[PDB]
Design a protein around this motif. Structure first.
Motif, PDB file in Angstrom:
ATOM      1  N   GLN A   1      36.036  26.474  42.831  1.00 52.67           N
ATOM      2  CA  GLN A   1      36.928  27.465  42.264  1.00 52.67           C
ATOM      3  C   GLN A   1      36.244  28.815  42.142  1.00 52.67           C
ATOM      4  O   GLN A   1      36.923  29.845  42.155  1.00 52.67           O
ATOM      5  CB  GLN A   1      37.435  27.026  40.893  1.00 52.67           C
ATOM      6  CG  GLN A   1      38.619  27.870  40.419  1.00 52.67           C
ATOM      7  CD  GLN A   1      38.207  29.078  39.599  1.00 52.67           C
ATOM      8  OE1 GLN A   1      37.257  29.024  38.818  1.00 52.67           O
ATOM      9  NE2 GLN A   1      38.938  30.179  39.764  1.00 52.67           N
TER      10      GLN A   1
ATOM     11  N   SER B   1      41.716  22.105  47.231  1.00 55.09           N
ATOM     12  CA  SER B   1      42.071  23.359  46.600  1.00 55.09           C
ATOM     13  C   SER B   1      41.547  24.522  47.429  1.00 55.09           C
ATOM     14  O   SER B   1      40.595  24.390  48.207  1.00 55.09           O
ATOM     15  CB  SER B   1      41.479  23.440  45.204  1.00 55.09           C
ATOM     16  OG  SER B   1      40.069  23.436  45.297  1.00 55.09           O
TER      17      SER B   1
ATOM     18  N   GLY C   1      39.680  27.038  46.926  1.00 53.45           N
ATOM     19  CA  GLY C   1      38.259  27.331  46.910  1.00 53.45           C
ATOM     20  C   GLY C   1      37.476  26.584  47.973  1.00 53.45           C
ATOM     21  O   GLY C   1      36.488  27.088  48.508  1.00 53.45           O
TER      22      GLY C   1
HETATM   23 CL   LIG Z   1      39.672  26.112  44.087  1.00 52.15          CL
END
Ligand SMILES: [Cl-]
Ligand SMILES: [Cl-]
Ligand code: NA
Length: 129
Positions: free
Chosen positions: A121, A24, A26
């Motif tokens: 995140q 992801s 992040g």
């Molecule tokens: Cl993320």
């Protein structure tokens, strides 16, 4: 160029890193923060005489050519200087090759030691994406 956190997150998303190989966005922002403090011009010399370049500290021993790492590979087929540009395209495209090579983001020591297993995140929180 020193990126802002959300500015970099948006640039990385536009270049296809969000969820690239399951990582992801992040993760990538977190890695860039601790590799380079978001500075595209970051360089650091390694013990073996290789040098790490750019926002993701890509190493000349395997990934780029800097003319001074004898017996090194250039698997991204780029001059290492290209990794220091304000335009992160070359870093991103090379990072995509590194993260695909079997070891994932463990290739980035800072990611392993400071991002892996954390709430990554948090690095994109508040960003307009
Ligand atoms: Cl993320
Ligand atoms: Cl993986
Ligand atoms: Na090289």
């Amino acid at each position: 160029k020193v990126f802002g956190r959300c500015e970099l997150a948006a640039a990385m998303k536009r270049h296809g890193l969000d969820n690239y190989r399951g990582y992801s966005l992040g993760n990538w922002v977190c890695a860039a923060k601790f590799e380079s403090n978001f500075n595209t011009q970051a360089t650091n010399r390694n013990t073996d005489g290789s040098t790490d370049y750019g926002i993701l500290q890509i190493n000349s021993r395997w990934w780029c050519n800097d003319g001074r790492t004898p017996g090194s590979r250039n698997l991204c087929n780029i001059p290492c200087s290209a990794l220091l540009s304000s335009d992160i395209t070359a870093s991103v495209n090379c990072a995509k090759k590194i993260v695909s090579d079997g070891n994932g983001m463990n290739a980035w020591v800072a990611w392993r030691n400071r991002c892996k297993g954390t709430d990554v995140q948090a690095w994109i929180r508040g960003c307009r994406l």
